[PDB]
């Protein structure tokens, strides 16, 4: 019952959302919104507000929650996508986990065969660990939030499915995240360095000496692990098939302008996140990175894990315009 | 250093805020704003985003943070008030703790003597305990956030100092809060029932059985402890003296329309607060209470305490209009 009660609570708190039953998924109350590319995501419960907190104008059209840390079944994704399609296509944003990849792929193929124009964006921003417990390649973590906002803004503006997907894929190649935990959702004064959002092990356990030193090593790891080459699969709706694409991320470098996300993994005092941000700006300025915009708070949690993550996303004038554009969701709200 | 770093991070993250030094306090960057009543609050650190997260158009003009769970010294309050005064006077919002009461009282007096038109609003919404560790009467807790927004909206509209204060005092008499904790910032499956935001003891320690049963008894206590008679002290700037006023709160009753705040005390998973809200709505509906607006998240924390509080505030059409009015702060943002 607890998950059901939680979802009923969400629907009651937010009349602008619609909680569907049999199967369970969540959409904007006004879905389908005709005339715009629809954005859809989803994944396990326990990462709230990701993704149901991001449903609204300028962001997601709908989301499909699964069981705790467990991919939604493909029926939820298929039915949600059908519900949100506004005739300009549906963009599926998928975090890189083996379950999520499998279920979103099953749904995507069937959607295409049912006449829905669809394609995909995979998120693999976590720089810490290659081939973790539930992931081939790198894990999809808090950069998903930033990409959902930016691609959400483009869709809301009227950009085509192809333009939205291309933007999503580009941003994914330019975003870098790392997380640490001081306690699971460890010995005294010890941290799990490079932790995942489903409790997966990091690079190692190591001493926690101070907040400042912890940020320093997270920041250093973003730079050192920033270069990354891998194959990602995307749906080509013209051909009606999966296409593999080899792509390379460049590390962040001097001259880069970034959006910074300092994210609470569940149980970190907010005061401490401002201390994290303080050290982050100093390391950014020293490395010739300009932080243009920031988000600080609980945007991609891991239940009640004690820890935090840092995400830096390279941006330009055009992406900043997309950032500044209106968003109206439970977790992010600004503009007219 | 760590407090200093956290405040530096805040100032870096939000250029709409100005961090002052010698003494330390925080104001809107555009303060003093001419032609509008200025709103000021403050208190110990450890309750973030209260109060620095509420600085901005439609809410606080400034805030005076103290040391952890410790009132700001009166020099901070005096100097902050001087800075923010826009020639229409300053309203000081004070949570009912002996330290805060003492320090804001010292500052208010000196402000009046220095030519600043000033008055005060005391918050004593916590229904759990009378005469706690650091409180004469009832503790001031999360309803402070609600009053800050509503009075903030009244001041921004151009209401006089007296109207703003009268609104503040009235809302204080119609707002009711209670909190529980499952872990300090307890035995197995035991909760501290009626905990305070500085870790003060509650009504007692009692079993935790389920989230629904906990909400039931929190809600029942709001009703049972709702009636309250006490003396509150306010600054009469016409007489230039402290004036005692005896006032009585009525309990919420069938027919009342309310704003609901479900508040994370620091380490409760967000999903769980929606579960709390689900049950709260059911009990409200059963009791003839109409929840008109809600806030769910971390608005008045107690460092990394595991627990939550529920606040219900009686409202009417006029107050709902003030709720819906624009607000632009780090922690609360909506409207044009």
From Swiss-Prot, chains A, B:
What triggers expression? Activated by DhaR.
Miscellaneous notes for this chain? Answer: Unlike the carbohydrate-specific transporters of the PTS, the complex DhaKML has no transport activity.
What is the organism lineage in this UniProt record? Answer: Bacteria, Pseudomonadati, Pseudomonadota, Gammaproteobacteria, Enterobacterales
Any keyword Kinase?
yes
Which species? Escherichia coli (strain K12)
Catalytic activities: dihydroxyacetone + phosphoenolpyruvate = dihydroxyacetone phosphate + pyruvate
Q: Name one GO molecular function term.
A: identical protein binding
Q: What is the protein name given in its UniProt record?
A: PEP-dependent dihydroxyacetone kinase, dihydroxyacetone-binding subunit DhaK
Q: State the top-level EC class.
A: transferase
Where are the catalytic residues? Answer: 47, 198
Q: Which PROSITE patterns match?
A: DHAK
Pathway field of the UniProt record reads:
Polyol metabolism; glycerol degradation
**Binding site residues for dihydroxyacetone:** 44-47, 95, 100
Q: Where is the DhaK domain?
A: 1-332
Q: Which gene encodes it?
A: dhaK
């Amino acid at each position: 019952d607890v998950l059901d009660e939680q979802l009923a609570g969400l629907a009651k708190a937010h009349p602008s959302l619609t909680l569907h039953q049999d199967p369970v998924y969540v959409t904007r109350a006004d879905a389908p919104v005709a005339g715009k590319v629809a954005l859809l995501s989803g994944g396990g419960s326990g990462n709230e507000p990701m993704h149901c907190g991001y449903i609204g104008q300028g962001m997601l059209s709908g989301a499909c929650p699964g069981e705790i840390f467990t991919s939604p079944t493909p029926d939820k994704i298929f039915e949600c996508a059908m519900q949100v399609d506004g005739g300009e296509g549906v963009l599926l944003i998928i975090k890189n986990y083996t379950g999520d990849i499998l279920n979103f792929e099953t749904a995507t193929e069937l959607l295409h065969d049912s006449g829905v124009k669809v394609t995909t964006v995979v998120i693999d921003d976590d720089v810490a660990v290659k081939d973790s417990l539930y992931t081939a390649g790198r894990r999809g973590v808090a950069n998903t939030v930033l990409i959902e906002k930016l691609v959400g803004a483009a869709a809301e503006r009227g950009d085509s499915l192809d333009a939205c997907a291309e933007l999503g894929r580009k941003l994914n190649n330019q975003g870098h995240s790392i997380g640490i935990a001081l306690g699971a959702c460890l010995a005294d004064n010890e941290m799990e360095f490079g932790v995942g959002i489903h409790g997966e092990p990091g690079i190692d356990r190591r001493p926690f000496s101070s907040l400042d030193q912890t940020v320093d090593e997270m920041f250093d790891t973003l730079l050192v692990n920033g270069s990354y080459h891998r194959t990602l699969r995307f749906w080509d709706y013209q051909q009606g098939s999966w296409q593999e694409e080899q792509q390379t991320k460049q590390p962040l470098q001097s001259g880069d302008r970034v959006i910074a996300l300092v994210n609470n993994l569940g149980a970190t005092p907010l005061s401490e996140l401002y201390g994290v941000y303080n050290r982050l700006t100093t390391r950014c300025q020293q490395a010739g990175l300009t932080i243009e915009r920031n988000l600080i708070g609980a945007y991609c949690t891991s239940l009640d894990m004690t820890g935090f993550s840092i995400t830096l996303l390279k941006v330009d004038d055009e992406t900043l315009a997309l950032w500044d554009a209106p968003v109206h969701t439970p977790a992010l709200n600004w503009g007219k």
